[PDB]
Design an enzyme around this catalytic site. Structure first.
Site, short mmCIF file in Angstrom:
data_model
loop_
_atom_site.label_atom_id
_atom_site.label_comp_id
_atom_site.label_asym_id
_atom_site.label_seq_id
_atom_site.Cartn_x
_atom_site.Cartn_y
_atom_site.Cartn_z
N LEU A 41 0.69 -1.07 0.26
CA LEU A 41 -0.22 -0.15 0.41
C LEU A 41 0.40 1.42 0.16
O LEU A 41 1.70 1.21 0.34
CB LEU A 41 -0.96 -0.27 1.39
N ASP A 42 -0.14 2.77 -0.60
CA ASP A 42 1.29 3.50 -0.90
C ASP A 42 1.27 4.44 0.34
O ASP A 42 0.97 4.07 1.19
CB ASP A 42 0.63 4.25 -1.87
N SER A 43 1.79 5.10 -0.14
CA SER A 43 2.49 6.73 0.74
C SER A 43 1.33 7.32 1.46
O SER A 43 1.39 7.53 3.15
CB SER A 43 3.84 7.38 0.21
N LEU A 44 0.85 7.11 0.35
CA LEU A 44 -1.18 8.35 0.78
C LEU A 44 -1.77 7.88 1.97
O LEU A 44 -2.03 8.09 2.88
CB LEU A 44 -1.71 8.50 -0.50
N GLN A 46 0.00 5.43 3.98
CA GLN A 46 0.67 5.43 4.79
C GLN A 46 0.44 6.48 6.23
O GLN A 46 0.40 6.41 7.00
CB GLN A 46 1.53 5.25 4.74
#
Ligand code: PC1
Ligand code: 3PE
Ligand code: 3PE
Lengths: 87, 459, 157, 606, 176, 128, 171, 60
Positions: A41-44, A46
């Site tokens: 799952l990506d940065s956003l 996170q």
């Protein structure tokens, strides 16, 4: 004003509110397992996770430290540095 | 009075013929016994002043200030160690004996009938103070400070001598009573204008007024604690004492010719309270506080009301005590951290914990604490100047606001908020420091109880 | 001991001398040392800085002095006494500055104008005078003990 | 009679012993708070009885002795009076402060510097008592600055935290603006009536009473947080909780208006003064009610409420009705002491957050405090007819039936509607919402202390307003003959305010996310007044003190004009005199021309 | 303006804008579930052009994003009661006594607390034991003449504690 | 979608809409690199002189000393009396003084004239 | 004891309370317990003290003074004459200020006794107040700070010369 | 010798002392003179503290 804090209890609470959030799997979610590298799952989302921990434990964590959590064990490290969670 | 002078003479060879590590107790004990015998003076009653040994007399313009000097001596004698304990025996004994001779010329000044004797003991008050500040100033512009000091005080106070001699040989003698009981009203030609301007300009130099005031703050901030306290309290309140004496002549012209000094004094009061709002160097704020109070005193003497004179002498005594104490607190902080600046030594509520009580108490006596003697003096000055004119109260109240503001700034910036945690040399506070706090703030509260002792001879 | 040459005499000319010197002595970039310039007001050869500096400088950098917002080595801004937090909050306001003061002055002027319009135009309910019987409460006003009892009475309606 | 004077003096002097107890301590008493609480309880139960004597018969007295500095034609002594205001004012404040002693045992239990706290708080109580019993006006000035500086120390109790000493600085500055107003009043009293002694100033009728009464106006607006000088009050709320409760419920905040009520027979006259009274009061009332909406902290909302209530008291002095204003003081004191104590209890129960958001669901989380809070908010706006009824409703009646200003009554009316709507908002968001507050919850009120305090203050907030208001000695003339829609207007405005705020809430349920439209911003940004004044009036004076005072007038110009001018003149005369090249023909030519210019030009042989 | 990096990257800047907008929408929006709705609407707006790599169009969108953030921000943001500007913001900085002190006591009051001062003596011996050689050599060998960062390397070499740890290990409890 | 937020002398322009933090050039990042080098070296010598156990006094901060000598007594050299300096001096010194002189002469002449009338309200005006 | 002809106490008035109550009467039980617990033992200690007073006794006197003649009967300079004259005048000035203080204390007492009705039953005391203060304002007021006696007498000449020319212009 | 024999003894010594600047004398003298003036019919505090029979004003 008497909150008691300890290591493994707050490890349980962090791991619990990561388990409650839906789009991760509850199967391969170790205590020290990554966020971006293995779950994918990506940065956003996170940083939405970081928002969840801040909204749970009652103190903001800064954007200088928000780059570098990346797994629940390092999260428990930084929170135990915040509230001085040892005996 | 001569029984108050002659043991101060005999107290001078005490330090000489006492051996080392024994001089200290001797000087302390004996000057305190002189302080008891000093407070025994207070016999003054009713009709006259108490006049004897023909040169000597005591008003209640002179009794409380004389007791102030003879009580502020041993306090200072104790106060001025830890910065010369490591100096030598000879310079130690010389320092102490120089202070004692300074006290002797001070008391000679305060019990002066004859105004030429007053002027001689006036510059006799001057001459040791320069040697004190210039030899033990412990900074680098103290030299220039002493030079500015002596030339301002002399060259202002020099033609006062010529005017007094002119009085001496145009009227007769200069007994203060025969200056009184004989004074003819002098008209408003130009020579009377110059004579009034000469005497008033000499003491305007001494107070200072606003236009001649950079005399003082360099001399305060570049001095040892003994010279700083004697300088501030005793010298400026001596200038006020001398003006209260010499104003009895030249009455019917000073109304006409004493306007512009009021304007200079009030606007300088506001500018002085504003310049001590924003400086660094904690030591300087108390000097500018002193300039603010003395400008208010000068307003009080240029008006001629008994309310004004009672408020004047009360303001003198109270600010002498307050500014002397707060100088001692500044010296204690500077001996904790060898800085002289302000913002380096933050914190100090946690560490040195009951030092905070004495900062609080000294700063509230500067605040005009609501039963304090400072408030009594400023209040009656404001009442009398409102009777002088109905419009002056804006400058007085704006002075009050800014005075409270810089007092609180000094309180909550030097001693509030956070230890800077790179310091690690500040000790707990010694017993001597708390002893000096006690020796400052017992007489101010006792005078806050019964103050009718120290109000003016216009009672 | 401290060198006299770490103080700051003279002005900023010429362009080699004082620029290299102020960069090496104030620990700054060479061009970003900007003196005032020589307005003649004293002010030395000390730098110009953007003057706001204290409710800026984000608290999470974690420098040395935790409330002064310092770094131990810095040009030490000239008006710093006028700027420490507790003195002047130059944070960006959420609207503007002109628009702030326009709304404030408009509301104050409006309320004082309607106060004046109210002052010329009172209220009154349909009410007579308070009838006081004894010559309008005479001999219980300020005085006149026996000088002029002046007849004024009320009549039943 | 011996009994009345002896009991009032011992109620003064029993507020002296714990300061003597810490001064003779040299220990660590772990029961010194209990000592102070029980001596306060003893002082109240010995003080209620002489008030009972006052309402039974009277015998209404002044005591005075111990004169000091009786200098010129006046004299001043310790002199204080017990009359109506000074009699019935005291036991209210004692009861309030005893409750705050309980709540500060609990709320401030876990700090190891508690003894200093109770020393300061008791000293503050003693100072406010000396203010409200005194009749010699110098002693009023004593009490004025004394409660000002105790306000300073107890706001700046939490050292550290730049908010706290910033708040302390603004509070003490506005108290000095009260000081300059008060000393103008004292100046005119001295130099036109030979004294400041209240009996004598009542005894004369001063005519040209513009200047002193305007000084008293400045005193009120500087002390009691009113417009132009009000916004130090939420900054003052940024201190401790029972500090703020005591400091802004009864004590330290009525002393702006208590003085004007003390001057009631002189404010019976001079209609210009009462016009400025009521206009200032209406301005404060509507402006703080407008600012009171759109705010996300509890204590700032409650202080805006007490500022608007003091605005109603200013209007109540503007109309010639001082005694109902005293009634407003009493019920207001019980009222907001109970409200602050309950709310700060909730704050300490829920982890220092204090804000309206993240504080959502609290009803049935034990409902003792929620009962307490809604009893406070229904005693607000005066539900008929309770302790909160009497004050506000007799105020709007007597104000509605008088020769008022035709903007002021409309302002008080609209601000009554506004105080209804923010009290409805504090109810809805605090207690009756779906629960937003963070987890790991430690809701705990198994405390005998706090149930004692909340218990006895709702006791005083349900019956004691009627106990006060019933047997007041009637010191005015009631109107009591109103038309329709002028006695019904109170309940009408409060009911329409409740419906208005309820439908605000029901539209706030919906999902729309409308952008702010600058009236939201004007009600939220404190009216832009604290921002603009606190950003400009520092910067102007200090830019006019960097260049003007420090860098330009004293140092640079005074050192140029007196030291530099003289010093450079003497140095240049030196460099022209002593710069003689060592030749001899030059010196003898000087001798020769000196001889000739002394003979034939400037003669000496005559 | 940050310790390790000399500057913040653009992805970092976009991320901080995200956290600020999300925080102010928390402060804007009560009842928390309509908050959740509006937050996913905001996340959808960032999903609208998330997969584009025109860096100049990205920073164009970032400038318009800063404009649309400042247009509708909230006046008093809901900040937590330990944050800067918060309700506490080092409340107990009163009770935070430094640990260089506590040794200017009296030996009677020192003898009232035996074991803590004995263990403090062995702490201080641990400090002075490995202060000079290892710490000073690792700070005068491994850095460059210009250090060019501030993160100091740990004592991976042989033995004792990583360098310059005294006033960072020995900070107080933040709630005494 | 905004009126673009003009700054003032007080309303400081925050780091978002600069827009100078967009057209990043070479010397901008070179300046940030050297600026971090400066802060790095100063914190390095600070932390060296901050963690020493032999350290007794203060850390002896040179920049605060330098600014103190700047603001205190290095005002006067340099200084030349220019047009601006002298005009602002004679305005800020003599101006308000002569203003208060005129207002005090005004009030005193009004008072002397009114008491020379004979009808001052000295009904009792004792404490003068 | 104190002289009542100079400190005039007006005629006492005290009504008897007449219940018409059945609660009854907290203040009666209050004052009974107050008398028995406070008034008796303090009176016993005070009577012990007054027997200790009556063991042996003192006296103190009023320091009476003569009347040295005048300041209009001294010459040009004559310091030994003017010293007597002006200390006589200054003693008059002290006692005259105390007379003003006594009149002001009378006015305070009149104001407090009549309570809420000021404007009756204080007429005579306010009238004698304005008389004594008209005397004081006309006589000693505007002489400033250095009163000796001579500025008072120059004021005296100035004032009566003003009234001389007033009665000449209105004669 | 700074507190226990100086401060407290000075406090007792200025606590009571004579009528400082002749105070209680003036109280008792004022009481006697006002009793005299209101007994013997004369006006209290007559103006013209010197008798105008002992004056010789300049004339025209
Ligand atoms: C400041 C300068 C003050 C000079 C001393 C004051 C003084 O006596 O001035 C009058 C003196 C001269 O005035 P005088 O004191 O000689 O007064 C005139 C008196 N007769 C006419 C009898 C000679 O002037 C100066 O001192 C010069 C300036
Ligand atoms: C009239 C003469 C007034 C002279 C005032 C001189 C004041 C100099 C010092 C100012 C000062 O101390 O400013 C600091 C303080 C800032 O407070 P603030 O910024 O609101 O802090 C909130 C927390 N961030 O700001 C203050 O303390 C501001 C003081 C209040 C404003 C005073 C004047 C109000 C009325 C002016 C006339 C209308
Ligand atoms: C109204 C009252 C106003 C009183 C003003 C008095 C004069 C001004 C203050 C006097 C002191 C001036 C002073 O100290 O100037 C410093 C200067 C020496 O400076 P510097 O270059 O450091 O010298 C190194 C060693 N001399 O020293 C000098 O240049 C000294 C020059 C002589 C000054 C003597 C005093 C004035 C005499 C005037 C005679 C006419």
């Amino acid at each position: 004003d008497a909150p008691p804090l300890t290591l493994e209890g707050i490890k349980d609470r962090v791991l619990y509110v990561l388990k409650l959030y839906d789009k991760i799997d509850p199967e391969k979610l170790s205590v020290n397992s990554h966020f971006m590298k293995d779950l994918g799952l990506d940065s956003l989302d996170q940083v939405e996770i970081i928002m969840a921990m801040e909204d749970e434990f009652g103190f903001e964590i800064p954007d200088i430290d928000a780059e570098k959590l990346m797994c629940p064990q390092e999260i428990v490290d930084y929170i135990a540095d915040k509230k001085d969670v040892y005996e | 009075m001569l029984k108050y002078i002659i043991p101060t003479m005999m107290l001078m060879p005490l330090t000489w013929l006492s051996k080392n590590s024994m001089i200290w107790i001797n000087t302390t004990l004996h000057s305190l016994l002189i302080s008891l015998t000093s407070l025994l003076l207070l016999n003054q009653f009713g009709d006259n002043s108490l006049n004897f040994s023909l040169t000597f007399f005591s008003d209640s313009l002179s009794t409380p200030l004389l007791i102030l000097t003879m009580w502020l001596l041993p306090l200072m004698l104790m106060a001025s160690q830890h910065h010369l304990s490591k100096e030598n025996l000879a310079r130690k004994k010389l320092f102490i004996s120089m202070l004692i001779l300074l006290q002797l010329f001070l008391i000679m000044t305060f019990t002066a009938t004859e105004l030429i004797f007053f002027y001689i003991m006036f510059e006799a008050t001057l001459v040791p103070t320069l040697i004190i500040i210039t030899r033990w100033g412990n900074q680098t512009e103290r030299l220039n400070a002493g030079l500015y000091f002596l030339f301002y005080t002399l060259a202002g106070s020099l033609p006062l001598l010529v005017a007094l001699i002119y009085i001496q040989n145009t009227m007769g003698s200069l007994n203060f009573l025969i200056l009184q009981y004989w004074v003819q009203p002098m008209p408003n030609s130009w020579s009377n204008t110059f004579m009034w301007l000469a005497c008033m300009m000499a003491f305007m130099v001494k107070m200072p007024l606003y236009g001649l005031h950079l005399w003082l703050p360099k001399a305060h901030v570049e001095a040892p604690i003994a010279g700083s306290m004697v300088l501030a309290a005793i010298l400026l309140k001596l200038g006020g004492y001398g003006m209260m004496r010499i104003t009895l002549l030249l009455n019917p012209i000073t109304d006409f010719m004493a306007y512009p000094f009021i304007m200079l004094s009030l606007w300088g009061m506001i500018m002085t309270s504003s310049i001590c709002l924003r400086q660094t160097d904690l030591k300087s704020l108390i000097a500018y506080s002193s300039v603010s109070h003395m400008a208010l005193v000068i307003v009080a003497i240029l008006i001629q009301t008994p309310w004004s004179y009672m408020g004047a002498t009360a303001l003198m005594i109270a600010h002498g005590l307050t500014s002397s104490m707060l100088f001692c607190l500044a010296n204690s902080n500077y001996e904790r951290v060898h800085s002289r600046t302000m913002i380096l030594a933050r914190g100090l509520q946690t560490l040195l914990p009951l030092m905070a009580a004495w900062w609080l108490l000294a700063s509230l006596t500067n605040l005009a604490l609501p039963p304090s003697i400072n408030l009594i003096g400023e209040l009656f000055v404001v009442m009398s100047t409102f009777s002088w004119s109905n419009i002056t109260i804006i400058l007085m109240g704006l002075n009050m606001v800014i005075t409270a503001l810089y007092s609180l700034y000094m309180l909550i910036t030097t001693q509030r908020g956070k230890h800077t945690h790179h310091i690690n040399n500040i000790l707990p506070s010694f017993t001597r420091e708390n002893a000096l706090m006690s020796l400052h703030m017992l007489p101010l509260l006792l005078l806050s109880l019964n103050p009718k002792i120290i109000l003016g001879p216009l009672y | 001991s401290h060198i006299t040459k770490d103080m700051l005499p003279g002005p900023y000319p010429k362009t080699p001398e004082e620029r290299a010197a102020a960069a090496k002595k104030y620990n700054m970039r060479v061009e970003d040392y900007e003196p005032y310039p020589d307005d003649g007001m004293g002010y030395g050869d000390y730098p110009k800085l953007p003057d706001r500096s204290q409710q800026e400088r984000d608290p999470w950098y974690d420098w040395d002095h935790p409330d002064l917002r310092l770094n131990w080595g810095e040009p030490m801004h000239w008006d710093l006494d006028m700027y420490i937090r507790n003195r002047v909050d130059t944070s960006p306001t959420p609207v503007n500055w002109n628009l702030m003061c326009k709304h404030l002055f408009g509301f104050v002027a409006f309320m004082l104008f309607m106060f004046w319009v109210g002052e010329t135009y009172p209220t009154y309910q349909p009410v007579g005078p308070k009838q006081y019987p004894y010559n309008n409460l005479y001999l219980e006003r300020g005085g006149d003990p026996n000088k002029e009892p002046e007849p004024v009475v009320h009549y039943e309606i | 009679m011996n009994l009345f004077s002896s009991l009032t003096l011992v109620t003064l002097i029993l507020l002296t012993m714990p300061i003597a107890a810490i001064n003779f301590n040299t220990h660590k008493f772990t029961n010194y708070p209990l000592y102070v609480k029980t001596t306060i309880s003893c002082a109240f139960i010995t003080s209620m009885i002489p008030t009972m004597m006052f309402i039974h018969t009277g015998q209404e007295m002044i005591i005075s002795n111990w004169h000091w500095l009786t200098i010129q034609t006046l004299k001043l002594s310790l002199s204080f009076k017990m009359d109506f205001f000074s009699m019935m004012f005291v036991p209210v404040a004692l009861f309030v402060t005893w409750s705050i002693m309980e709540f500060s045992m609990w709320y401030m239990h876990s700090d190891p510097n508690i003894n200093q706290f109770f020393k300061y708080l008791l000293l503050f109580l003693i100072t406010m008592l000396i203010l409200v019993t005194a009749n010699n006006l110098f002693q009023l000035f004593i009490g004025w600055e004394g409660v000002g500086i105790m306000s300073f120390l107890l706001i700046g109790w939490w050292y550290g935290r730049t908010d706290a000493n910033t708040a302390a600085l603004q509070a003490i500055l506005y108290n000095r603006i009260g000081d300059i107003g008060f000393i103008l009043a004292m100046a005119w009293f001295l130099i036109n009536l030979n004294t400041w002694d209240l009996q004598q100033i009542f005894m004369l009728n001063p005519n040209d009473s513009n200047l002193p009464l305007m000084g008293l106006i400045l005193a009120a607006t500087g002390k009691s947080a009113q417009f132009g000088l009000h916004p130090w009050l939420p900054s003052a709320m940024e201190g401790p909780t029972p500090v703020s409760a005591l400091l802004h419920s009864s004590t330290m905040v009525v002393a702006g208006i208590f003085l004007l009520i003390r001057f009631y027979p002189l404010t019976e006259n001079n209609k210009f003064g009462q016009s400025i009274m009521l206009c200032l009061g209406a301005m404060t009332t509507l402006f703080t009610a407008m600012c009171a909406l759109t705010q996300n902290d509890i204590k700032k909302i409650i202080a805006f409420s007490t500022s608007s209530q003091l605005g109603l008291m200013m209007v109540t002095i503007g109309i010639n009705q001082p005694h109902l204003a005293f009634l407003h003081i009493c019920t207001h004191a019980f009222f907001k002491a109970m409200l602050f104590m309950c709310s700060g209890s909730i704050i300490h129960s829920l982890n220092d957050e204090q804000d309206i958001r993240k504080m959502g669901g609290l009803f049935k989380a034990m409902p003792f405090t929620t009962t307490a809070l809604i009893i406070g908010s229904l005693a607000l706006t005066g539900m008929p007819f309770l302790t909160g009824f009497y004050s506000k409703d007799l105020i709007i009646e007597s104000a509605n039936t008088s020769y008022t200003n035709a903007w002021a009554l409309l302002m008080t009316l609209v601000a009554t509607s506004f105080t209804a709507i923010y009290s409805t908002r504090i109810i809805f968001f605090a207690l009756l919402g779906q629960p937003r507050f963070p987890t790991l919850i430690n809701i705990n009120e198994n405390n005998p202390f706090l149930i004692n305090s909340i218990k006895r203050l709702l006791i005083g907030s349900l019956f004691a307003g009627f106990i006060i208001s019933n047997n007041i000695p009637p010191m005015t003339i009631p109107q009591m003959t109103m038309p329709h829609y002028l006695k019904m207007t109170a309940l009408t405005v409060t009911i329409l305010g409740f419906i208005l705020a309820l439908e605000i809430s029901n539209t706030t349920h919906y999902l729309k996310f409308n952008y702010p439209s600058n009236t939201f911003k004007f009600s939220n940004l404190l009216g832009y007044y604290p921002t603009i004044m606190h950003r400009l009036t520092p910067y102007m004076n200090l830019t006019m003190s960097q260049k003007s005072a420090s860098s330009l007038l004293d140092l640079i110009w005074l050192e140029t004009i007196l030291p530099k001018t003289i010093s450079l003149a003497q140095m240049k005369m030196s460099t022209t005199i002593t710069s003689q090249k060592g030749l001899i023909k030059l010196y003898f030519l000087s001798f020769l021309i000196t001889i000739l210019i002394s003979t034939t030009l400037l003669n000496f042989h005559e | 303006f940050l310790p390790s990096a000399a500057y913040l990257t653009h992805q970092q800047k976009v991320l901080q804008l995200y956290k600020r907008a999300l925080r102010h929408l928390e402060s804007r929006c009560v009842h928390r579930d309509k908050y959740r709705y509006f937050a996913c609407l905001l996340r959808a707006r960032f999903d609208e052009h998330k997969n584009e790599k025109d860096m100049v169009k990205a920073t164009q969108l970032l400038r318009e994003a800063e404009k649309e953030f400042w247009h509708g921000q909230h006046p008093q943001p809901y900040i937590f009661p330990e944050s800067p500007g918060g309700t506490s913001y080092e409340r107990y900085e009163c009770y935070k006594v430094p640990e260089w002190c506590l040794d200017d006591w009296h030996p009677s009051e020192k003898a009232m607390y035996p074991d803590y001062f004995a263990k403090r003596e062995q702490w201080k011996k641990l400090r002075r034991e490995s202060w000079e050689r290892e710490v000073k050599q690792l700070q005068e060998e491994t850095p460059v003449g210009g250090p060019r960062t501030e993160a100091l390397p740990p004592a991976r070499k042989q033995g004792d504690l990583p360098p310059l740890w005294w006033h960072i290990v020995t900070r107080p409890r933040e709630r005494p | 979608s905004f009126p673009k937020y003009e700054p003032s002398r007080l309303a400081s322009l925050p780091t978002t809409l600069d827009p100078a933090e967009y057209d990043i050039s070479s010397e901008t990042r070179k300046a940030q690199a050297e600026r971090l080098a400066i802060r790095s070296r100063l914190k390095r010598e600070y932390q060296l002189q901050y963690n020493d156990p032999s350290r007794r006094g203060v850390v002896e901060d040179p920049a605060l000393i330098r600014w103190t000598c700047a603001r205190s007594a290095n005002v006067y050299p340099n200084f030349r009396p220019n047009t601006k300096t002298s005009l602002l001096g004679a305005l800020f010194g003599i101006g308000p003084l002569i203003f208060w002189y005129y207002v005090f002469k005004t009030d005193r002449d009004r008072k002397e004239k009114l008491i020379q009338e004979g009808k001052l309200d000295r009904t009792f005006n004792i404490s003068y | 004891s104190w002289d009542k002809d100079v400190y005039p106490e007006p005629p006492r008035r005290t009504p008897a309370p007449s219940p018409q109550t059945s609660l009854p009467n907290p203040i009666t039980y209050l004052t009974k317990a107050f008398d028995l617990l406070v008034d008796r033992p303090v009176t016993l200690v005070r009577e012990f003290i007054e027997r200790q007073h009556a063991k042996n006794k003192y006296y103190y006197y009023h320091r009476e003074f003569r009347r040295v003649p005048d300041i209009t009967e001294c010459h040009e300079k004559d310091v030994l004459c003017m010293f007597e004259a002006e200390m006589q005048w200054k003693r008059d000035y002290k006692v005259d200020q105390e007379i003003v203080n006594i009149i002001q204390e009378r006015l305070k007492a009149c104001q407090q006794r009549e309570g809420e009705s000021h404007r009756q039953n204080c007429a005579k005391e306010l009238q004698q107040f304005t008389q004594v203060v008209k005397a004081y304002q006309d006589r000693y007021h505007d002489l400033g700070a250095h009163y000796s006696a001579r500025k008072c007498l120059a004021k005296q000449k100035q004032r009566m010369l003003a009234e001389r020319k007033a009665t000449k212009e209105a004669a | 010798f700074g507190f226990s024999i100086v401060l407290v003894l000075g406090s007792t010594f200025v606590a009571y002392l004579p009528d400082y600047r002749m105070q209680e004398w003036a109280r008792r003298e004022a009481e006697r003179l006002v009793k005299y003036r209101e007994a013997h019919g004369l006006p209290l505090m007559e103006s013209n503290c010197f008798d105008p029979s002992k004056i010789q004003l300049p004339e025209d």
